[model samples]
Target: MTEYKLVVVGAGGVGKSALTIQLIQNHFVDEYDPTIEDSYRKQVVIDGETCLLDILDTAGYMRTGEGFLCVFAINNTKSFEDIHHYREQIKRVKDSEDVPMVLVGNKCDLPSRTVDTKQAQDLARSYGIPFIETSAKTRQGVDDAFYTLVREIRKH
Candidate 1:
């Protein structure tokens, strides 16, 4: 199998770090940790393949918001649709968007996704940004999520 360079992407938010830690490890949820050059080493497999996924978010991508990396839940449309608020918040309310942004689909590992991939891709397409998927429970697709977020952040 060709090792897929699995990727997941998203924008930033409140409790972003809380969600990120929830992403990292349930074991480490009790504890702690961006980059461009900033690259993180990680792995994932699709259809019998594996490769480094490469990835952070504010421990404070919480506490406070920095440059604008939007994140959303794949299983939640309310979560998915809410990203626009984040964009405006960054622009009209805070320093943000067009500007560094990403659309993410979380909980891909599970079987019950409310939003379709095409839906997200189309949304990202409309915005001209990257859309990636992740499963915090299984840890797949999580790395490239924030990696792309940070990489995009680095660009801005």
Candidate 2:
């Protein structure tokens, strides 16, 4: 079976877990329990493509009294701070430069509460990775996002 490493990242409460669940299990949790621990991984199949996706759901970036900080702080859930950490985690799990990656900005359904889509796009461009905004609530761009990564991996 072909294995793919997919990472979902965004600010806290932005539906990282929801998107993952919706895509993988076809379900959603309304309450959104934050007490769950970090790093939820799962294996899913798409269009007869069997692969294991290790999802790294890192802790939300918290804002500090003195602006934003890299270290995890309560009351701040900006995902920008945890990008590097998630990258490192992906390296540790996949340990392959050839492994396909999809950098997704979940919770795109609400533009008013977004954190700069352009910046996220720029980051994806910088890494030469596939970028897409997904809304698990509406199931927007969810299938395309996963399939795109699968296609890219097949190309290599």
Candidate 3:
């Protein structure tokens, strides 16, 4: 079986851990600490191929990975603004101009959304990466986000 390492990056309180746990355990976790960094591994099949996903829900520091999920909360404008910083840092750490990555706007189930989907879409377009909106609470698009990253890694 093949394996992929994926890093989740975003500002604090952006529901990074919630997304990871939802993908791994199929449950939602509302409480989190900013200082805590968690790693999870799950075996999944994408496109008829079985693979293992090693995910890191990080606070800020950079880590080695094959792909990156640049996640942000839709209700938080500043969190969305921080996506550029994370992307830059990831590229710097990987030392590659083009890396497998997906721009993720999480917490989309929230009623009041501060970040527009078009805005996120345009940003992802600018970076030449795939974009997705996810709701960890409702378990919407959670699997696709990871699977998409896996596919991106495979493509590269």
The TM-scores of all predictions, comma-separated, are 0.58, 0.62, 0.96
lDDT of 3: 0.91
Instruction: Write the residue-wise lDDT of candidate 3 on 38-105 in tens digits.
Output: 77899999999999988988874255788999999999999999999999988889999899999999
Candidate numbers sorted by TM-score from highest down: 3, 2, 1
lDDT of 2: 0.56
Task: Flag regions of model 2 displaced more than 4 Å.
Answer: 1-12, 35-77
Candidate 3 is scored at a TM of 0.96
lDDT of 1 by residue, 1-156 (tens): 222121222443323443455544432242223222122334544334444433334221221333344667666677777777656665654344455566767667657688889988898898778887765556566556656655665565
How far in Å is the alpha carbon of 1 misplaced in model 3?
0.8
In candidate 2, position 69 carries an lDDT of: 11
Root-mean-square deviation (CA) per prediction: 8.7, 8.2, 1.2
> Pairing residues by index, what is the TM-score of model 2?
0.62
Candidate order by decreasing lDDT: 3, 2, 1
Lowest-lDDT window of 10 residues in candidate 2?
A: 61-70
